[PDB]
Amino acid sequence: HHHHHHYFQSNAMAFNLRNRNFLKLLDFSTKEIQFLIDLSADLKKAKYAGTEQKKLLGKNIALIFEKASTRTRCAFEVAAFDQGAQVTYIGPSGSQIGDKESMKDTARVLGRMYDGIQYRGFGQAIVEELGAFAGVPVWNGLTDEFHPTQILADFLTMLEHSQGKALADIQFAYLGDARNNVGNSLMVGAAKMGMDIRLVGPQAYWPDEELVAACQAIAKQTGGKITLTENVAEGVQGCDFLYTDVWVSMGESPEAWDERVALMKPYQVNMNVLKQTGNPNVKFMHCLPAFHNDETTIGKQVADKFGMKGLEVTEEVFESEHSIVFDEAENRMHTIKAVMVATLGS
Amino acid sequence: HHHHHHYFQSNAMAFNLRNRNFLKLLDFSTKEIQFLIDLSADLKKAKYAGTEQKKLLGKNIALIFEKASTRTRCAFEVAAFDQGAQVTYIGPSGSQIGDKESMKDTARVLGRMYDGIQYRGFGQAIVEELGAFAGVPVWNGLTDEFHPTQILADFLTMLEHSQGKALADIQFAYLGDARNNVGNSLMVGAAKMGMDIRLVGPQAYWPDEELVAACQAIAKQTGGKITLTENVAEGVQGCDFLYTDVWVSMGESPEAWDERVALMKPYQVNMNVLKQTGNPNVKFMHCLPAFHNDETTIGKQVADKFGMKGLEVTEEVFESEHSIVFDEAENRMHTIKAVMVATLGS
Amino acid sequence: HHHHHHYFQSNAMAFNLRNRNFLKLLDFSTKEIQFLIDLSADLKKAKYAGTEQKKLLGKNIALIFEKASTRTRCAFEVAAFDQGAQVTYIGPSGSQIGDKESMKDTARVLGRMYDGIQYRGFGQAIVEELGAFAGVPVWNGLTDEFHPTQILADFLTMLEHSQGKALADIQFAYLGDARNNVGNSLMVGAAKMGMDIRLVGPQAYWPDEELVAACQAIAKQTGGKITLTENVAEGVQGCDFLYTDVWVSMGESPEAWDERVALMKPYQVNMNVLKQTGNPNVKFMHCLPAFHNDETTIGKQVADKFGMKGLEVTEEVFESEHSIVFDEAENRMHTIKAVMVATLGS
């Protein structure tokens, strides 16, 4: 009911992508990105039909998580397993890479043992170094400034939930705190693919100024469009998809929450916000986890203190027919599989 | 030297059990339980003969442990591996399911990625929710109120150590603190299979009153018998197996131990207690780990403070010829394999 | 460019080694050790040629790490995977084996489930007990007093970086704190294989006196030679390889560092020390991780406090053409594979 139905150019990309790292969307062309998205669709159809061909048979993959994330971890594990690879999960330890041993040294050892490496952690500088010295494909599971795999999942999902529209024809808005890896990659992604993106939220939390200038140079070339606005009505108008993510921070701070909630509350995605799009076929997306209700411990707590049931999105929207968050969530795997098969596939 | 040697009904169960969750013994019929126990015996013989057929080939299984347990973990891993499945071990993290994200959301994501899920954690309410929303078989590795896999292992072991007696013909006593998952499942198990169980220990630690009433309604139908008594002599008389489990608690409390030890000490299984059964072929069982001696750190500590070498069971009994705790321990795997193959086997 | 090129005796060892544990080099003959080293070379050539035959297909291996060590962990995982085995990684938990449950009990349970077990932890007494009661091959990933796998890797590397010299013809020096597992195994290894070893460092940190006497009894028989000296000039003279390892301790103590650095500094391996060998083909080895520079956090910290850029070895030596630390690091895997295939290989 909801899927993406797509010569010498099929394997021209196979060549370009073989042995490449996957550190950030900025490192790829629009065609290369489309290819990964198309490949994901095949791998997905193959798995469902029970006709998936293993292209990573015999390969060993190291999964470095300096900061735990079950959801991205599973995406890689299941993707690897389906393809015949074996996995070694290296989770958070007492020391972080750099504290007492450098990436340069770490990269060089893992590279001798494994065929591919996944890193999920801190600064992009770190993965970039791992990428430079490992000698095997390195893939960014998430850094402070970027989160590429997520966006592949997001665009595949958008294509699957459109009736024959290309990414170049889609319009979408991201509401909330865009000054982060998700916000950044969604903008680069939107730019690279010639989409119409709108970052709706407080000016202080729009993405990096330099990054926006860089992404707008790209947009101009791909026929895409980027608009940054604090005005919800104007921002969500006519969009095909609405997207948000938790904008509070577990930990700091008691009153920083009073403050934070006050600043971000106007941007929660609620039914009222979907109605402002003037598009009844509008779909809601969220990278997850979402604080969409009154049932978690931190949810009852937010309810008692701010009288709110859900922060960035309401339970009504989250469990609505417009919500496609779980298709989106599943797509992390098919897209991550695409990245591995394309770069390391034999 | 010690094993279980057992039409249209063979596959009538195959049907009933396909796609089922395995949350508690209360959810199954006596025939269904017997089937799982019989299947385990085949899988065990197959592995030993080097003729095991993989019925989970290609399947990916998620192992959720909110509270670590190497012994149940290994049982699942080795069972999965022997059957051609791949495994993702998700151990204890900073937050527990519910603190900041609900099972409803968690279940729905894992269900899209994995083919089967194992949960080991807190309240039964939690696994039940996972079972309702995952969309794939869910198996209870242990909750506060039940521990079904353990009992399958226990009954298989009983059958293996009997000379042609059916579970319906066995008599056994559980000494100690029965107000817990092990005590509960042993009672439901005993009831479902028409056995003669006797919970020997302080009235305050007999199982839940409602549960006992429920299990006695069952017993009456299966021709089983449940008796709860504080009298050891009367309780262990004529039993085929004696069973116990640690009844102290690592942590709370310094004097709660003085108190606890004083209350439970009369129920330790010692040679004197086996002799009270009037049955020289009596066998001792223990789900493990057992504080059976003077060698562990907490063992020397208990020795210096209460002058005891072993709490719930004595070293002499534990290393005696009556002890079958390690066959019992191995059987966790064969029985867990049975549960997975029966519910997810293709 | 750098590799080791080597009847009824080929399989006479196959017999001797089948089902053996690998707890310490003291438990093996010089021929047995050479065999493991030779086997490693084949397994290495096979993997590179893409013609490796799986001799552990279907086997399940438990990896016990009471004290984390990614580098030895990966070595085992990749070795197991390449050979068709499955792995269960049991990392550091709340309690250590012995605190509340004995090895005797633990060994007996794992032995029923797994086909082979790896232990990395505390005292040798512990692995020895695991080795006695598991009933399946047990392998020492590292204990307080020994670290055998590392030395196999080290000797293979030495053979690979020699132009047709046997271990019996090599000369090497270990500079620093030799009173530990690495120092111990290097000495036993050197003795067993008839090498010329020299432990260069403070007399207080020479290996155990009894162990040295034991190793010298061996050396005398194999035509090897062991010399312990505080004199660097005299110690490194004419060596083929120089070897060191971090001699500080993360944690204790602020001034114990002032003290420690002052005592060990004269033994850092710097270009000046390589030149003292009078051998321009000299190669540097280090088990890793090494504090060889000014870039890690603890590195900038050591730079600001003692004005040093690198402790046991200088960046210049570590990244020099003499450094073979990464070939050495890779060889942990090929040698560990050898140990498993030889003992459990079918």
UniProtKB/Swiss-Prot annotation, chains A, B, C:
User: A single Pfam family, by name?
Assistant: OTCace_N
Q: Does the keyword Transferase apply?
A: yes
Q: What is its main location?
A: cytoplasm
The metabolic or biological pathway listed in the UniProt record of this protein is: Amino-acid biosynthesis; L-arginine biosynthesis; L-arginine from L-ornithine and carbamoyl phosphate: step 1/3
Instruction: Name the reaction it catalyses.
Output: carbamoyl phosphate + L-ornithine = L-citrulline + phosphate + H(+)
Q: What are the entry keywords?
A: Amino-acid biosynthesis, Arginine biosynthesis, Cytoplasm, Transferase
What EC number(s) has UniProt assigned to this enzyme?
2.1.3.3
For binding carbamoyl phosphate, which residues are annotated in this chain's numbering?
A: 69-72, 96, 120, 147-150, 287-288, 332
Q: Which family does it belong to?
A: Belongs to the aspartate/ornithine carbamoyltransferase superfamily. OTCase family.
**Under what name is this protein listed?**
Ornithine carbamoyltransferase
Per the UniProt record, the source organism is Vibrio vulnificus (strain CMCP6)
Gene assigned in the entry: argF
